[PDB]
Structures are given as C-alpha cells and as structure tokens.
Amino acid sequence: GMVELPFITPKPEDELLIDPVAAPQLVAGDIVAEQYEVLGVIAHGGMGWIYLANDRNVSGRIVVLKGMMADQGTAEAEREFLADITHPGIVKAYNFIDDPRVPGGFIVMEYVNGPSLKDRCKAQPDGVLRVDLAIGYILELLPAMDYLHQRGVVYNDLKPENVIATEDQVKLIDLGAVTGIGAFGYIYGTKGFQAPEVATHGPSISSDIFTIGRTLAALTMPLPVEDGVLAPGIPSPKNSPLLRRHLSFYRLLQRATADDPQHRFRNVSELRTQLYGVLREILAV
Ligand SMILES: [Mg+2]
C-alpha cells in the first residue's frame, strides 16, 4: 500500500547549521555529557535552541539535542519506551541527558538529513505539492503512525513541518509529542491541526486520524488562515478546482477530519485503503 518516492539528496555536513529569540547557550566545540561534541544549532524552537552534535561513541553519528519538558519510576518507563521504538519511519531516540548550562536537559535523537514536507511545499509557486506526490508522502508515513497506534500510543502533533523527506523515505521527528492513548493532562498538538475533542477528551487513534487529514489538506491546497491558525474545515469544491475535479478526495478529507471522532476512519489501515484508492483514481484519469 505504498508507492515510490523521489530520492532527496541529503545536505552535506558543511551546510547543516544556521547562523544564530535569545543567544544559544551552547556553541561549536562544547562537550555535552562527555559524549556529544556540539557543532552548532539547526533551529530555534519553543524549548529554546535545537543543537547538532557529533556522538563520539558511535563512529560517524550526527545527533540532535532537543530540550526536554521539565516519580522517577514512571519517567524511566516512558524513556525506555521511546528508546526501544524500532520502526524506521520514526526518528530514533538515543539518550536523555542533563547539562549544567541547559537546566531542562536534552533528548538525544537521530538527525534526519532532509527538508521537511513544509519546506518542499514552500519551494513551489502555489505553496503546495502536486496531489499525487502529497498522497504518496502520507501513504509512506502511515506504517509509522500505525506502529505507534498498535502499541497504544499516538503521535499527537502530525503536521508538514515534522515529517522529513530523506533519501526515498520520510521520518516522523516529533518524539516529544508522543503520548499514550487517552493520556491525561495537557497534550502538545498544534492548533489548526489538532482534533477539536482532544482538549476535553484526551488523545486517541481518531485524533491522530484527524491530524493526518489536516496534514494532507495542508500539503495539497491553500487553506484559510485566521489569527495565525488554519481555519477549521476543508475548502469547498465550490472554491477549490482541485476538490471539484477529485470529489472522492474531498470526501476523504472531510471524513478524516469529521467533528465527531466516531465518523472518522477507524484506524490507519481503513484510511490507507481509501487513500490508495483515491490515488489510483487520480492516476487513472
Ligand atoms: Mg510538535
């Protein structure tokens, strides 16, 4: 139920860093946890700067240092679960470390070398991908979402910017947003992509299904933005020539983003069947 994605050449190592909101707390050459030699920063996020480093213990390995969200037994089990995720469509978690210069500590994860799907969209004149390519990217990441779901776990923050296209693959990079199905407390989704029921009922496979539909919509068509947030709903075929030509695609997007979670696709496999069917229709005509 997957297709062939174009090969995306990774960036050379001498082109991975940006030029440094506040100044970074670490700079090139700094040694973290006596294992990681800092190379620089690759982005500034809500948790502060996100660093790139050499892992000295593993030959050739480049890692990402990202701030962690600041009862040891429970925290130990959650860290071991992240570390043991085996699926190649998900970024690897290598370590969880502290540092006297960064109070919150770092999660140490695999550096995925490639553009995000948002980056690919921004390189187009219409700011969107061709519909067959966007569907192919979603089909490619569905095994990774399902791997989590079948282990009682959800990704919560799927959006074009945390799916990275590398080589002929895509990887999910947002390990920090993962929670158990039905987890209590505040869930770190993104408004405009997150399902409406999460803030009151907790996350579920159905709320992940919702973010997949919003992500696919964002990859393929312009979406109205209100106050920095993608407005709710799917554009109408009356307003979108893409949807008027592919009415089954419009229907799929509405079902995946149904206000009532019970009306959405029940799991990733049900979504894949219809999604691959929409693609074959588009490629047939
Ligand atoms: Mg996130």
Numbering used by the authors: 133 to 152, 160 to 209, 215 to 429
Please share text taken word for word from the publication where this structure appeared:
The Hanks-type Ser/Thr protein kinase (STPK) PknG and its FHA (ForkHead-Associated) substrate OdhI (Oxoglutarate dehydrogenase Inhibitor) are at the core of a conserved signal transduction pathway that modulates central metabolism in distant actinobacteria. PknG has a unique modular organization characterized by the presence of a highly flexible N-terminal region containing all known autophosphorylation sites and a C-terminal domain composed of tetratricopeptide repeats (TPRs) flanking the kinase catalytic core. To investigate the conservation of mechanisms involved in the regulation of PknG, we studied the kinase isoform from C. glutamicum (CgPknG), which is devoid of an Rdx domain.
According to the electron density maps, the N-terminal β-hairpin loop (residues 131 to 134) was not stabilized in any of these two structures, suggesting that this motif might be responsive to the C-terminal region of the kinase. Finally, we tested the kinase activity of a CgPknG deletion mutant lacking residues 1 to 129 and 434 to 822. CgPknGΔ1-129,Δ434-822 displayed an ∼7-fold-lower activity against OdhI compared to the full-length enzyme, whereas phosphorylation of the 17-mer substrate was unaffected. These results indicate that neither residues 1 to 129 within the N-terminal region nor the TPR domain of CgPknG has an effect on the intrinsic kinase activity, supporting previous evidence for MtbPknG that both regions contribute to stabilize the enzyme-FHA substrate complex. The two protein chains in the crystal structure of CgPknG and the two crystal structures of CgPknGΔ1-129,Δ434-822 are shown superimposed.
